[PDB]
Amino acid sequence: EDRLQAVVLTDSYETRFMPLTAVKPRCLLPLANVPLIEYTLEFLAKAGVHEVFLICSSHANQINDYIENSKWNLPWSPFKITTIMSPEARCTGDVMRDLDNRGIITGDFILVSGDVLTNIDFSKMLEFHKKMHLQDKDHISTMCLSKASTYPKTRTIEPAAFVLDKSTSRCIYYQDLPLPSSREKTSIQIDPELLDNVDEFVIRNDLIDCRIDICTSHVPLIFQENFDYQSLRTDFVKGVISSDILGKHIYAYLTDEYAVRVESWQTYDTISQDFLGRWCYPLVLDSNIQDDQTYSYESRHIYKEKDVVLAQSCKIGKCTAIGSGTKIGEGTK
Amino acid sequence: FNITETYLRFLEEDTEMTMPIAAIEALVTLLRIKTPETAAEMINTIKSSTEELIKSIPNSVSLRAGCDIFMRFVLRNLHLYGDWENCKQHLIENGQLFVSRAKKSRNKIAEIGVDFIADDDIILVHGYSRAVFSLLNHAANKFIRFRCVVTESRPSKQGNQLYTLLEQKGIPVTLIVDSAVGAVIDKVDKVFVGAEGVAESGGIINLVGTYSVGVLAHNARKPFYVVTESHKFVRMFPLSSDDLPMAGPPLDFTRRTDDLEDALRGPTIDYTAQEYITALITDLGVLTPSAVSEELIKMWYD
User: How far does the signal peptide extend, from start to end residue (chain A)?
Assistant: First the structure.
């Protein structure tokens, strides 16, 4: 059960952020005055990772220097970081074949695309992955899911519809829809090959993507075998389901608690407002993870670090955070 | 050689040389002339000079308290039955070292007692002590947000004096009368006070309206503060609400007058009980309730 290795997909969703990612990398950008990687690394440490892998090509030098300065190059760290240097801008499938050629994957490995902040304990996830792997031999990868904000009417970038089992929690279909932004398409066609094998069909759009994966040793061998697969969700999951290799299973995990992957600007804005609020119970500014952080919680959701300078007769609002060594003038809201 | 005359010479000075610390320094100078080798010749003449000082006192309490601590230190010197000369040299030197300790204590408190004033808190300040104002100034030096409300105390008009000293710093203020002081306790976070003395019981010896402040704050449940330098402790136990050492009037009722001359007379110094004080601040740590008495028991060994 022990010894766990992780692979992080960086250089993945660049230029998806339109004005930025020009000089400095995607994941260097701060959410709450602290880099996005730091959140992911904290999730790795809480999960129990012994060996860390990172995928850097574009602005790779700045990433490597940041890891040099990081809290994990120091000997006491539970994990060690090794960077993968690849050709500039390639699909996830191409990187998977590169890693299989190098051959470091042992048993069960971890793959995360993008940077995700979640308060969900991973120890439960590992156990249920292992329990379901002991159920049948040909079982592959694990997917995370969380319940949405009642209706996803504001969420347009992630229109992923999931068809799931009530008994075994196996995914059946993945579909993207333009619906509310572009009223053009309405139809969704589903394969009727798995009708009586499941019986208890459950179709949901009210679930948020996470793109966090627990994967077996089968995965890198399949990527090299079928080099036509470029993506990991849109074509790959659907390809696995639609009788590519008969008798192969993939997991879908439901969790009540908060887990949202960063992808767009207006999603980033909501996650940030959720972090300022007490949505992520452990993940709060006051606990201080970067060690240099000296944030203190104040009532009405107001965050202030040490050495905060403020002018007299100034009003502060709700769900606000201010860094260290900061000066503010009069008449400010 | 005189001691009352030496204390009278401090007119335009003050501020740095605190009123008791200047009287203690005057006690050491009078000691070091006529040989501290003899304990019969010197101590008796020191006792006579303190008695002459008390007889010349109009409305001061702290000078009597400061004498006690001096005496105590003198007696404690040769408690090790040490050389009647190195013990003496250490006693004479502990006069300038006593005044130097007033600076070190103020350096301690102004970093400890800034913690009590939180993010954006409106303060109603009453009285004037060098410790409380030093907290107020070195919090402004710490760049912290606080509002200030001035109480119209009536001894030698202290409110106006306090208001002008707050103007020289750069902190927004307005005059509040001690009559209307009840109507302020809702827009005030915390109430602060500077004391003339702190009781054996745990109560306070203060100015022309401080008990009244203490009770109103107890009604409004809003905190009540006492901040001072640790030398204003007497073995005094004011048993009742209106009993204090006085040279002038303990409430006098005058006859029928037409020219209007005999009027003013009211209790200029008033006591408040132990229950009304929420917090007390000195250089001797952060302590309030039974702490004062334990200090006095430790000193007096009785």
Answer: none
